[PDB]
Subunit: 335 residues, 2 copies
């Protein structure tokens, strides 16, 4: 429960901003696979009370703040203009490390969520490679489970608390603004999707006995949370998910209800410059998007869900601390 | 003829050896590569005399050469020793692209079997993502046929030519050495396997008029070919298929005569140190297996067969060029 610090492999000649922040504000990693394996001790974890997240969070905020400068930043009727220079942008892995004395407890093996008991435990100094991908609804470029899909929540019996669904077979998603220049779109292969929501539905049913399971879009709110919003090559993509998070889990099987066509599902995307910042409760304005093909080839690795004779589930997000929690669940700082 | 170049999503921060090699041997892939479809054409392909295969072969040889360094390398009477560190091993997709002045022809006839005429043709810059998986008998993590199973051979009536069966439904296989530190095992669901060999049995029952079609284990030879040999996380697995390739397809129906248990076929595996190199003629000796659970969860996407009243088929392999052919059958390098 003390001051941690980051390590990475960020070359110092790279103009890309995450490297520029890293080099100046981090450390080159270590090739010491220091892994004090153990398997007695059955310790308690809690991925929701865990200061590593707040630590990381207010560092991603720093990163973003130093890096992506909006033309305008409004907050409390207070405008603050500056330069809007387009930059080079791509998540590099960060490792969070503890200084002496004493470091990081890590839970091992397969099906083990974020709360409570766990047996096989190792002790480490730093953590695995983590991209600080800022996104809603869908988790991108993240890790996988080495077995079966697993469900995470501070409380599933609470319709208010975000459900982090951790997958194990990633779903390819491809976003494009071709060569109306804030009109974009995203492709997602339909079978992998139906299959995914099938499995996730199956294990959702294992936590909600004999209820029909309905996947249905978000109720409403800001475009950041009611769509799959994310950053790509500096540009802020807001991607539709009406015909993605609609589908029915019935009888023991799942069937989709989203318009497909000869294989892939297409989502309508809008690039925007006015954004409601995830860092604080203000809003930022950037310059019009760069010209040319604006494309991102990304890996869907997790879901953010929100629950309402049927149980309804809608995509969540908003809070990036959750996005960090999705992978900082494993660990716990100790003496 | 040209000198292709590889392309991948290799991470420079990744210490997994395929990434390490690909980062310095290949180019970053294009996030979105576009086909150019062609009506009007009809071109001939021959998966069995393709140079792309040899090029890829060489590349994977170099890759394995730089990556997996054996403690000992023996070739006849001459032996070489060097450092043999345990590494992180997990294949990544490799694209093969033609340089400027050339292009890659791609057949989209999804019943096309590598040899002969192909009508629906497209041109591309780079191939699809191909994981250079080295294995025998079973082809792992390949692309699936898009409709009915496909039988491939340079020559079917020649029992000396290896037959490549392209499945269209992957058969999950799970190999594991649990917590004897060299004894491991694989698990396969029997139902999927029986459906598989049923349909494969049919597709073979076509090409060979009306004969009892038997599936039997490899008659003999080196363990690398008499067993399902493959690499899991740098460790060389030799898995037993006496209970897998074991059955009879007769007049419409398949019968699995191989031992099973609770619907599961379990292969008995052995992690070896002494291997017969596939790259060249000679033996390689590696260090004892690492500690902890060594598990690989893979998908069977193809089969390698050799044919002998009744027709008998046995698991083949050994020439990894076929393993590349299994994926590179669609493609043809051309100058324009
Ligand atoms: C309140 N709520 C969900 C929720 C929880 C926490 C936060 C928010 C929302 C607000 N989040 C964001 O503004 C936000 O994430 N913006 C944002 C910025 C960049 C990217 Cl790529 C992105 F995906 C989202 C943040 C507050 N920000 C501000 N409004 N302008 C933090 C619901 N009622 N569902
Ligand atoms: C000759 N033959 C089949 C055949 C064909 C070609 C080749 C071979 C065998 C030899 N192949 C191999 O040694 C080989 O593939 N080894 C090998 C290494 C690693 C893995 Cl994972 C593997 F599956 C096999 C190679 C020659 N190597 C050498 N013996 N030491 C290449 C039959 N009579 N059935
Ligand atoms: C291990 C793997 O690759 N995929 C698994 C699949 O086998 C399993 O049926 C499903 C149910 O949780 O979870 C996922
Ligand atoms: C609603 C909820 O979060 N329940 C969890 C349960 O999933 C978990 O198994 C247990 C300890 O393992 O702690 C509690
Ligand atoms: C999940 C948790 O830690 N505490 C409570 C749980 O005991 C209670 O059942 C639920 C609603 O009944 O609200 C929450
Ligand atoms: C918050 C938001 O953008 N919601 C829209 C929804 O109203 C619309 O029906 C759907 C498809 O048109 O796209 C999305
Ligand atoms: C958004 C919602 O709740 N349901 C939609 C439905 O209106 C639409 O007809 C269908 C076709 O893709 O997709 C789902
Ligand atoms: C959302 C996101 O960051 N996606 C990234 C993409 O930007 C990057 O180009 C690719 C590999 O370079 O990996 C993924
Ligand atoms: C083993 C096999 O099926 N071989 C066939 C061959 O007989 C046929 O002439 C050719 C035509 O495309 O397709 C292939
Ligand atoms: C397309 C599909 O789902 N399954 C096919 C099956 O229809 C076909 O009979 C078989 C070839 O014998 O290949 C597989
Ligand atoms: C086109 C071709 O090569 N056909 C051959 C044939 O000449 C040979 O008699 C037979 C037996 O080996 O195998 C096949
Ligand atoms: C090449 C090889 O190992 N073949 C073995 C064989 O000797 C043995 O009789 C059988 C049953 O254990 O399993 C297989
Ligand atoms: C290889 C063959 O032709 N038949 C085998 C037989 O040898 C073996 O005893 C039995 C049990 O595994 O499975 C079958
Ligand atoms: C034709 C055939 O082999 N069918 C079998 C079936 O009888 C068995 O229940 C299942 C699991 O062992 O595997 C398959
Ligand atoms: C022999 C082999 O290639 N096994 C791999 C396995 O290690 C990996 O976990 C899986 C998913 O990428 O694909 C397969």
């Amino acid at each position: 429960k003390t001051t941690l610090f980051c390590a990475s492999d960020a070359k110092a000649y790279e103009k890309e901003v995450h490297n520029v922040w890293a080099t100046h504000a981090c450390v080159p990693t270590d090739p010491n696979p220091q892994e004090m394996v153990l398997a007695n001790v059955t310790e308690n974890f809690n991925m929701w009370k865990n200061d590593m997240v707040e630590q990381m969070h207010e560092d991603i905020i720093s990163l973003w703040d130093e890096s992506l400068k909006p033309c305008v930043k409004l907050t409390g009727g207070s405008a603050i203009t500056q330069a809007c220079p387009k930059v080079s942008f791509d998540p590099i892995p960060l490792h969070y490390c503890a200084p002496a004395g004493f470091a990081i407890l890590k839970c091992n093996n397969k099906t083990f969520n974020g709360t409570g008991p766990c047996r096989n435990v190792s002790t480490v100094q730093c953590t695995h490679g983590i991209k600080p991908v800022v996104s809603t609804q869908l988790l991108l470029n993240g890790s996988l489970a080495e077995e079966e899909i697993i469900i995470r929540s501070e409380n599933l019996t609470n319709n208010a608390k975000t459900i982090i669904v951790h997958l194990n077979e990633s779903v390819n998603i491809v976003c494009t603004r071709p060569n109306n220049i804030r009109q974009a779109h995203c492709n997602i292969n339909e079978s992998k999707w139906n299959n995914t929501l099938q499995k996730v539905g199956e294990e959702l049913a294992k936590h909600f006995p004999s209820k029909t399971i309905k996947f249905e879009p978000s109720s409403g709110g800001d475009l950041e949370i009611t769509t799959h919003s994310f950053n790509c090559r500096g540009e802020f993509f807001y991607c539709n998910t009406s015909d993605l998070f609609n589908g029915t889990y019935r009888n023991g099987t799942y069937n989709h209800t989203g318009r497909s066509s000869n294989g892939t599902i297409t989502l309508q995307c809008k690039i925007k410059q006015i954004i409601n910042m995830w860092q604080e409760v203000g809003r930022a304005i950037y310059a019009p998007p760069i010209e040319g093909e604006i494309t991102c080839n990304s890996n869907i690795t997790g879901l953010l869900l929100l629950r309402d004779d049927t149980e309804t589930f809608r995509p969540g997000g908003g809070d990036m601390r959750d996005n960090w929690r999705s992978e900082l669940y494993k660990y716990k700082v100790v003496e």
